[PDB]
Ligand binder design. Structure first.
Ligand SMILES: Cc1cc2nc3c(=O)[nH]c(=O)nc-3n(C[C@H](O)[C@H](O)[C@H](O)COP(=O)(O)OP(=O)(O)OC[C@H]3O[C@@H](n4cnc5c(N)ncnc54)[C@H](O)[C@@H]3O)c2cc1C
Ligand SMILES: Cc1cc2nc3c(=O)[nH]c(=O)nc-3n(C[C@H](O)[C@H](O)[C@H](O)COP(=O)(O)OP(=O)(O)OC[C@H]3O[C@@H](n4cnc5c(N)ncnc54)[C@H](O)[C@@H]3O)c2cc1C
Ligand SMILES: Nc1ccccc1C(=O)O
Ligand SMILES: Nc1ccccc1C(=O)O
Lengths: 684, 684
């Protein structure tokens, strides 16, 4: 049952279809090239060298290899991040970023002989992330070993909320220190109420298709689902769930579930003095700090229930590592494999330039324009046949939103407010061109993008000797030291991760991994933004000491009468002075970590997810596609960036074929035709 | 009719009762001293010299004057902010702050002859903010003149969302450039749906007591309601509204209202051509950017409907200025008045120290302990009879949450992780002491405080000649230039406010006032945190250029042949180079601007609002009270800070009288007994 290789994870998730794209398994769509292109010499730009852009490049490579003699694809990849791996062909980050897949290498002067790696962005990969594992197989092979990510509960864990402490491993109460824990009771109540049972009676509060979500998850993952089930999910049942529940937050749903359980007597008054509403509140907030398997989702309580349900269906918490020292190696290997698969028909050039503007203009074949600035702030203008905008939404906004929403005789585009040179474009149309006649339709996609929610996130790291865990002051549970701590201290979630450069001498002490308001509460103490230290030779000691100080709390345990300062204070203080670190995604140019949908946001994110269907309108001459986890129903996952890239390339194939969906492979067609189109075109 | 003096505003809202405290008009409670104290020589601490702490001092002065000969009150006021007015007897901030009432004086070398003031925090005051005006009258007199705050719609305004532009004043179509504007139509739909009609048919979607909120607002503002009506609101109908709608976001509510109106045919398909869900979505997001009279509430869409409904009942948008050059003068004048009214019986000393911990300890008469650090990090400990903790929630957390939840024989408290000196306290109980026997009751208050939502906010300012508004490219209405701009450019809300140091030569160009995700999106560009410039003589020129560059957008006006760069880009660029500024409340030690409740947050904030009722439990003997807008149902308003102060002093009086509510005035008594108690046992 535990996957031990890339191939075992890959095969576990190969069939899984997400509910907003329930007709199609993306890994099955990706098994062969996505389609065919007419003979030609295509000039394509990819803006962004992260997971989205690089997956898109790989699929373009697969398409290029199918082109006849004399034809080919030339791709210009724009990548503004000076630390990207694409520009590299104590704490080091240079060359160790692929967007939000971002490593920091801790070393003592020789980066080839390092101590540990801080995984600053992506770090844990669901088993049924089928497209992720599909690409991991392309990058590494099916035989490459993987490990269980050491989430809370997967290793011995301490949980602290208010007066409550729990030490546990797993969900078997035999392996909880207090089998009568209220935490365990609330967890069962919330699981019953949200997920329900895969067999038998339906007990969940928020059914899909009048059944528990556990039953729908099994259908979505089936090799051979019942006839019509996937269509009915896609067109009826999941839309009905959204109609009912997209206006309900995760926090509101947890409180409804808790309230019913408290009324029934399943959850008792917290002790003899708490009133009704206070007891209900305590349980809601207790569950909030505990979570679903990856730490407290209290900070994520404003997400739509729809968004949580996507993660429930996916079994999101059951996560693995990649077969790497640094996760960036996955994206770097995919980039190299893209060039190999192109078979010499794909040529790639990297531009260390920031794109400022996209538009359609002029009367040439190559009408998709990109205006960029290089590292000397010099302007460049380049025209393309097709462009894939592979950047998340706040980075995309300035590129797409400043050209208005209809034809313009001329525009002087660029970063004029910065004092940078502009370029005059003539006969201009917006880049995200949903209509030649309706400014509102053009506005809808732009405004949607600009109002997606980027979740805030920060990570505080230090380097500690792994042997620190063996000290008598670190608790042991079930034969191993505590290596995950979930708490209301302000740190939120903390992990003591063995170094992947190796039992290793060192561990990465992820002292605090925060989301949303948990991150906001810390931000004043970070000192430098987005990264402290901002240099390779510094250490964020002052910042880190503020985190240590949040851990300076008197904690009463059942095992001792006199409360002492929390042991975790001592462990955080055991970290070495050098190489203390924080990265704040919020103050990075991404304006946060990743998209999570609020109530009502489905309508915006889904528009983005379906945007590539514009290629069905042959009379619309739109050359731009979008490729990021921002434009998916899995913001915060490689799987979402990869899904979005698959969408983008499928749309581009249809556009290149002037609206002919038959140019997509049989298995890839549903990527376009299984969605509600964003343009109205005739049936069939 | 428009109010023209402090006294006119004061009388307007004198009776208004908020729905969570519907049995009391706070201005009426505050008219006479709140009660009486036994004879004695009291030693009190107030932590924080903002609006909460200073109003609490004022009320303690009033009490002090009533004490008999030989009795008195000594107050130690702790204020950590070096820029506080309390510590003061180009951009200058020193001496110009009272917490989140914060001015920046723009000058050329002589601060007595400045150019303009930037109101960095509080700036606009609802007419019906009765307690605010009550204190403004204490500070300035009833005769002092006030002005209508130049909100969007109160002065000529441009609104931009997607392809839609409107130019307007108020809500009469005759005063809109496009009287058939869809924007104005959606405002009527959403207002009808949320607020409804004060007379006639009930048209609102979310009734209170089965009627439109407008009807309830009239009852809550009556001199002589029903007695029965107030109690029924307090105990039945507002609680039922909470039960129903605390789990519904404002954004979800807006979409429900728009959906029904679109199905009825009150709103047309957008462009004649977007589909049903695209049309509804467009209208929801259009309304989101337009707002309720103070700019778009899109960034606030995650607040509960309960929270928005408090502001609807209060007519919050109808706002005025104070009779000052800088709003901090209000708080300074209240400080000075506190000392005058204490008639010699009040002694005040100011400490420039940061409180690190509070607790009860020991066996002496004075048990309420405060541990603090001065500006060079020396430790101080002092014991008091009573303590008012007048700091917002994130600042309160470290003070109250690190001592555990029950009796402890001894603790070494302080900022040990910062390397600062600790102090040993013996026989220690938590400061927010709700139980002698329940650690969960103690944990509930602490955990609630720590998880309140501090809304993010930032303000970008520059100095501009007022005459820039007379440039030919600045639009005008009846001779008056546009002075407010509400946009989806990233700037959110922009104002050109005439200097109060005076027609004035200069204006404060509030180039961007953002909340929540609107602020997050900008934050990467701020450069220095929380303030750029950090010095008096620097300028945030690079930051401000990024704001000019967000305004560099092609905007199409009706009738025009082509889009042209937005005129507002030109206006922003007219600001002088010197004195460009941002302040980010999020990276200040407050960890944001002010409390706004998410879905499910009622129970956390309401617990805090009712906390002072612990005074009813005589044997408990808890000496700590809390006083901030964080512990109110008006986070983001002085009114909330003042209400919480009034609560804190009322509770203090009851506690000083060993639980006897007859020590409060007849008018003040409901401050305590009109709320559900926080201690169920013992009764009181
Ligand atoms: C804190 C955090 C935790 C996460 N946890 C996980 C996890 O455990 N598992 C998982 O699967 N995923 C996780 N993710 C999500 C995963 O990192 C993202 O889904 C994925 O990396 C996003 O790829 P992308 O291509 O959409 O965007 P990005 O990674 O943001 O890449 C975009 C690229 O475009 C470039 N760029 C942007 N603007 C421009 C411009 N104007 N011109 C030129 N270049 C530009 C950028 O420099 C960047 O390299 C996490 C992310 C973060 C930040
Ligand atoms: C951007 C913004 C816009 C706003 N707009 C409006 C508006 O237009 N109208 C309106 O009525 N209100 C407005 N408000 C709200 C208003 O400013 C607040 O409600 C009010 O000022 C808060 O007072 P307070 O006493 O609760 O807290 P604060 O003002 O935060 O004061 C707390 C004080 O305690 C001190 N302190 C904190 N921690 C410690 C410690 N450990 N030891 C010692 N001292 C400490 C601080 O330095 C500070 O001086 C706005 C606020 C902001 C920030
Ligand atoms: N990567 C994520 C995205 C969304 C929510 C949680 C996670 C998590 O890793 O727990
Ligand atoms: N001061 C506020 C608090 C809450 C929401 C709006 C405002 C405003 O001034 O518009």
């Amino acid at each position: 049952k535990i996957a031990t290789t890339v191939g075992e994870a890959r095969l576990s998730g190969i069939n899984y279809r997400h509910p907003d794209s329930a007709l199609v398994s993306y890994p099955v769509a990706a098994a062969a090239p996505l389609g065919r292109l007419p003979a030609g010499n295509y000039r394509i730009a990819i803006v962004g060298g992260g997971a989205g852009g690089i997956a898109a490049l790989y699929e373009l490579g697969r398409l290029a290899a199918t082109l006849p003699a004399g034809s080919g694809i030339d791709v210009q990849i724009y990548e503004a991040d000076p630390d990207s791996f694409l520009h590299d062909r104590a704490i080091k980050v240079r060359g160790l970023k692929a967007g939000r897949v971002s490593a920091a290498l801790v070393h003592n002067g020789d980066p080839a002989s390092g101590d540990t790696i801080y995984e600053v962005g992506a770090m844990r990969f669901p088993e049924i992330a089928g497209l992720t594992w599909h690409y991991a197989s392309a990058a590494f092979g099916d035989a490459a070993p993987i490990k269980v990510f050491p989430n809370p509960g997967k290793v011995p864990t301490e949980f602290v909320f208010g007066n409550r402490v729990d030490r546990y491993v797993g969900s078997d109460p035999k392996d909880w220190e207090d089998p009568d824990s209220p935490t365990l009771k609330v967890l069962g109540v919330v699981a019953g109420g949200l997920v329900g049972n895969p067999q038998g009676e339906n007990v969940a509060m928020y059914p899909i298709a009048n059944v528990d979500p556990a039953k729908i998850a099994a259908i979505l993952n089936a090799a051979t689902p019942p006839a019509d089930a996937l269509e009915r999910i896609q067109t009826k049942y999941w839309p009905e769930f959204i109609a009912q529940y997209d206006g309900l937050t995760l926090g509101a749903a947890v409180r409804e579930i808790v309230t019913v359980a408290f009324e029934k007597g399943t959850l008792p008054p917290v002790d003899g003095v708490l009133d009704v509403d206070e007891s209900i509140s305590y349980y809601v907030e207790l569950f909030g700090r505990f979570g679903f398997g990856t730490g407290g989702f209290k900070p994520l309580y404003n997400i739509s229930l729809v968004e949580m349900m996507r993660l429930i269906l996916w079994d999101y918490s059951n996560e693995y590592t990649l077969p790497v020292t640094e996760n960036v190696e996955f994206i770097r290997n995919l980039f190299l494999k893209a060039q190999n698969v192109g078979a010499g028909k794909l040529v790639v050039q990297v531009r260390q330039e920031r794109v400022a503007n996209a538009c359609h203009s002029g009367t040439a074949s190559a009408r998709a324009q990109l205006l960029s600035y290089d590292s000397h702030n010099a302007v460049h203008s380049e025209a393309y046949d097709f462009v894939i905008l592979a950047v998340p939404h706040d980075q995309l906004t300035p590129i797409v939103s400043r050209s208005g929403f209809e034809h313009a005789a001329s525009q002087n585009l660029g970063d004029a407010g910065l004092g940078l040179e502009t370029h005059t474009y003539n006969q201009v149309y917006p880049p995200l061109l949903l209509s030649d006649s309706s400014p509102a339709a053009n506005a809808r996609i732009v405004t949607a993008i600009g109002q997606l929610h980027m979740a805030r996130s920060s990570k505080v790291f230090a380097t500690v000797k792994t042997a620190a865990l063996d000290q008598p002051w670190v608790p042991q549970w079930r034969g191993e030291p505590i290596k995950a701590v979930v708490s209301d201290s302000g740190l939120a979630a903390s992990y003591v991760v063995p170094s992947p450069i190796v039992a290793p001498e060192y561990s990465s002490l992820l002292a605090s991994y925060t989301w949303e308001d948990d991150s906001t509460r810390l931000r004043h103490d970070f000192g430098l933004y987005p990264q402290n230290p901002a240099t390779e030779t510094g250490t964020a000691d002052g910042m880190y000491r503020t985190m240590v100080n949040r851990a300076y709390r008197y904690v009463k345990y059942a095992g001792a009468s006199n409360a002492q300062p929390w042991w975790f204070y001592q462990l955080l203080a055991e970290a070495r002075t050098a190489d203390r670190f924080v990265f704040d995604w919020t103050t990075n140019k991404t304006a946060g970590g990743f998209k999570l949908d609020m109530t009502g946001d489905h309508h915006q994110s889904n528009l983005c997810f379906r945007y590539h269907t514009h290629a069905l309108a042959a009379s619309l001459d739109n050359r731009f596609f979008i490729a990021s986890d921002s434009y998916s129903h899995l913001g915060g996952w490689l799987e979402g960036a990869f899904m979005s890239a698959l969408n983008a390339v499928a749309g581009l194939i249809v556009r290149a074929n002037r609206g002919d969906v038959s140019a997509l492979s049989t298995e890839a067609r549903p990527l376009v035709i299984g969605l509600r189109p964003v343009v109205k075109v005739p049936a069939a």
